[PDB]
């Protein structure tokens, strides 16, 4: 291994520092979607949570992931921001 060519497996939705800073508590779901774009992954079970995961795997270079979890209430108003810059 380490010699077989592997393409880049980009997964998730693109996140930038400015974009992540553009969202603050009390934001409506539509405003968050406008600022960051429609998430590619939500919580299908009994919770109104949005997952903005940003994966990049260049291939034999290590995988880097930033995951932003946005928890809304029933009304659709943003209630909690949880930004994880890197994997553990």
């Amino acid at each position: 291994e380490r010699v077989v060519y592997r393409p880049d497996i980009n997964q998730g939705n693109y996140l930038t520092a400015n974009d992540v800073s553009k969202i603050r508590v009390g934001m409506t779901q539509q405003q968050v979607a406008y600022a960051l774009g429609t998430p590619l992954m939500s919580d299908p079970f009994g919770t109104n949570t949005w997952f903005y995961v940003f994966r990049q795997q260049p291939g034999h270079e290590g995988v880097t992931q930033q995951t932003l979890t946005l928890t809304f209430n029933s009304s659709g108003v943003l209630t909690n921001i949880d930004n994880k810059p890197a994997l553990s």
Binding site: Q11, F45, V53, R55, Q57, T67, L87, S88
Partner: protein
């Protein structure tokens, strides 16, 4: 090539050939009888026999065209449920291969377009005419088609699990849960979703999926 005998003789010959099982000559006789006498006492019976012969003769596109023509021309014919069932059969037949069937190849990974069309047609027949004599076979075929379509989604999710595309795996399994919750393929796919959640280090979602799996261990 079809003689111009009176209509009764042509219909009798076509019926005799259909009974004998020679699909091609019966098809020729019925086509002659239909394109010579377009609107007569034989129109409906000849169209139904043409649909049946096209199906048995493996002329599936012609069978579909004839079925569409009959449905649009006679939307309220008493024997309309039979035409819907035949359309379902034709679409299900387009989703089969003999060479691969001989070798025992599971074709659930191939194009599911025709399976989807057959499912739509059979669902239409079952909902519209619950008391028809083709409803039980239609229901059995619907169950089989649902299982096959779920297996197709399972195949895609499994491939993306192999590739390392975790978001794609999660989305595919979520779509399976929303569309085919009660199939075996969804039960098989549930651990794939848990693994995809684990790899992305979202442990809460993985725990939720693990709880779902445990509650439905079987």
């Amino acid at each position: 090539e079809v003689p111009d005998n009176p209509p009764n003789e042509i219909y009798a010959t076509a019926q005799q050939k259909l009974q004998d099982g020679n699909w091609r000559q019966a098809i020729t006789q019925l086509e002659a009888l239909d394109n010579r006498y377009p609107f007569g006492p034989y129109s409906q019976q000849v169209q139904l026999d043409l649909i049946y012969a096209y199906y048995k003769n493996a002329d599936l596109p012609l069978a579909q065209a004839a079925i569409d023509r009959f449905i649009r021309l006679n939307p309220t014919h008493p024997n309309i449920d039979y035409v819907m069932y035949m359309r379902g059969l034709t679409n299900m037949a387009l989703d089969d291969s003999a060479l691969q069937g001989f070798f025992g190849v599971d074709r659930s990974d191939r194009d599911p377009q025709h399976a989807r069309a057959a499912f739509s047609d059979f669902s239409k027949l079952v909902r519209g005419y619950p008391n028809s004599q083709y409803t039980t076979d239609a229901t059995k075929r619907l169950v089989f088609l649902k299982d096959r379509l779920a297996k197709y989604e399972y195949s895609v999710a499994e491939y993306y699990t192999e590739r390392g595309a975790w978001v794609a795996v999660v989305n595919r399994v979520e779509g399976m849960l929303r569309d085919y919750p009660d199939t075996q393929a969804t039960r098989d796919a549930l651990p794939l979703m848990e693994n995809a959640y684990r790899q992305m280090q979202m442990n809460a979602q993985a725990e939720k999926v693990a709880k779902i799996i445990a509650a439905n261990s079987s």
